[PDB]
Structure formats: structure tokens, C-alpha cells
From a paper:
The MS-ring is a transmembrane ring assembly of a single protein, FliF, and has a two-tier ring structure; the S-ring is an upper ring located in the periplasm, and the M-ring is a lower ring embedded in the inner membrane. FliF is a 60-kDa protein with a large periplasmic region between two transmembrane helices. The MS-ring provides a base for the assembly of the flagellar structure. Previous sequence analysis revealed that the periplasmic region of FliF has three ring-building motifs (RBMs), namely, RBM1, RBM2, and RBM3, which are conserved in SctJ/SctD, SctJ/SctD/SpoIIIAH, and SpoIIIAG, respectively.
Therefore, we prepared FliF fragments from a thermophilic bacterium, A. aeolicus, and determined the crystal structure of a fragment consisting of residues 58 to 213 (Aa-FliF58–213) at 2.3-Å resolution. The crystal belongs to the space group of H3 and contains two essentially identical molecules in an asymmetric unit (the root mean square deviation for Cα atoms is 0.694). The structure of Aa-FliF58–213 consists of two distinct domains corresponding to RBM1 (D1; Pro58 to Ser122) and RBM2 (D2; Arg123 to Asp213). The D1 domain (FliFD1) is a compact globular domain composed of two α-helices (α1 and α2) and five β-strands (β1 to β5). β1, β2, and β3 form a core β sheet flanked by the two α-helices and another β-sheet made up of β4 and β5. The D2 domain (FliFD2) is more elongated and consists of two α-helices (α3 and α4) and four β-strands (β6 to β8 and βi). An intramolecular disulfide bridge is formed between C147 and C182 at a pole of FliFD2 but is not essential for the FliF function, as discussed later. Aa-FliF58–213 forms a dimer related by a pseudo-2-fold symmetry in the crystal, and β4 and β5 form an intersubunit β sheet with βi of the dimer mate. However, the dimer is a crystal-packing artifact because FliF forms a ring structure, and the 2-fold symmetrical dimer cannot be fitted in the cryoEM density, as shown later. We found that FliFD1 shows structural similarity to both PrgKD1 and PrgHD2, although the N-terminal α-helix of FliFD1 (α1) is longer than the corresponding helix of PrgHD2. FliFD2 resembles both PrgKD2 and PrgHD3, which adopt a common RBM fold.
Author numbering:
A (entry chain A), B (entry chain B): 58 to 213
Amino acid sequence: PDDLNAVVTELDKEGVKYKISPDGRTIYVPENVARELRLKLAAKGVPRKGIVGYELFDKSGIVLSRFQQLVNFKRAIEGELAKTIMSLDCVEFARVHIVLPEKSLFIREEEEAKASVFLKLKPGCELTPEQVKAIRNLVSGSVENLKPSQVVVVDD
Amino acid sequence: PDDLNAVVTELDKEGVKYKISPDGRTIYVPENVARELRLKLAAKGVPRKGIVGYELFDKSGIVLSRFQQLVNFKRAIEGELAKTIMSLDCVEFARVHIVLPEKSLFIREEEEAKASVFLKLKPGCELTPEQVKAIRNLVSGSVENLKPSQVVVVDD
């Protein structure tokens, strides 16, 4: 019962079909509701941004909204990249976040993207500059508007 | 494209509110009114490539909607995969399309996805069984919930 009280009590008033995951950190709300909650919660609670928007609700599951599908696909791409990075002996855990351009200038043909890689390394192990460079090229190789020099790798 | 003239007349009826770029394929429309739009002209209308949803507009550029950003990312991912497949040059042109899972049951994290690979080959060359398998592995390697067997490869 952590932090869920703030939203569920203000959503209990309207009376729309919502329910909490068996865990207790993932909520399921309509897409029109999730669109109002994603930006506000991202500034508030950060965990995996576990807010799922649906198009149709059922007791067994949900029909994902189109937006939620695209969100899930992005994180799936990032999860796969992180999985490859974790194949490194020194790397125990890895997380990849690709930053998408929010604007599009008519003066430019292409908008540049950014990317951050967070690594939990093995206590005694340490990455070489060539291995880090391999990481930058791996992530940037996924899309055309992302270059290795815009991929930042940090040890958290 | 003459298809654009069939969608600028569709909006000329609906709400009369749009923005045509100096480029002949790109059409700018607010996200809130592009939300109901793409659901309509889905069948025999547009591959929704030209339609771009924004939050704000001026003569120097636009603020991309979060939805549009995710849409562009998916196409960029597919475009990059297609670019790699086209590096064979036996394949003159390639189009990659990943179909996202529509449902999320409460007893399972994520369902399985599928993908279609549209290939345009040169009249002489023909794909080898090893190459086809490599194509399926390349596309399926993008996300965890996509298997090589669920990737169909066709020859346009």
C-alpha cells in the first residue's frame, strides 16, 4: 500500500473500472486517465513508470491502449539492449533509456536523440574504454537519429 | 502523392483545421484531433506516415506529441532493421513491420508479438535459406517477446 492512495481515492469518486496489480505498484486505468497521470507521476514517483492504460477492461486482463502498446514496445527495445550489455562479465545489472526528441524544427532534416545507460558493475571488475565504446555503438545502432557520442554511460 | 489530396479533402469536411508543409508528403495536425482521425482513415486511406500530431505549431517548427514520438520511434526501429536487410543489396528494398501484442492478462507479463518483412529483390538474385533465417533472427532479436518463427518473410 505505497503511494497508491493518492490516485485511487481521487479516482474512486468518478467511478471508472480500475484495479491494482497483485504486487501493489502497478495500476490499471483507462487511457484518458493514464494520459493525465503519466507526466504528473513521472515527476513524482519514478520506479518503472508502471502506469498501464487500457482500451477495454476485463477481470482476466485488459486490451492495451495504442499508446500503452508503443510505450511497452519502446521499453522492450531498451530491455533487449540492456540484456546484451549485461552479457558483459563486469556488468551485473544494466538499464537503457532512449531520450526521444520532443520538437521538430523545419530548418532541420532530422532531430537528434539521446540515450543513457546505467550500469551496476561487479565490485572488483571495471570496464575498459573499448567495452564502453561497444556499449555506445550498440544502443545508437538501433535508430538512425542516434549517434554513439550522444550515448552516455554511467556507473550507478 | 495524390493520396494526400484524398486526405486534405477529408479534413476539409471534418473540422477544416490542418497545416500543409512545403514538403508534399508531410501533413501537420493537432494531436487531439489527430486522435480520432487515424482511427477513421485506417482502412484504404493512409499508412499514416505523413500525418504528424503536434501539441503546438508555428512557422519554425512543432512540439511533437508524446504519442507521435513513440510512433516515430517504432518506425525508426523498423526503418533501421530494413536498412540492415537492404545492405545485402540482393534485396533492392525492404519494409519491416512489427505487430504489437494487443492484450495483457493479469496472470502474465507480456504476450507474444509478430513481424512481417516485405522484400523487393533484384530480378537475378534470390535469397538463400540461411539468409532468410538470418533475417528472422535479426528482426526477432529486437525484443524478447518476438521469436524468429513468428517473423514472416515475403517477396513483393
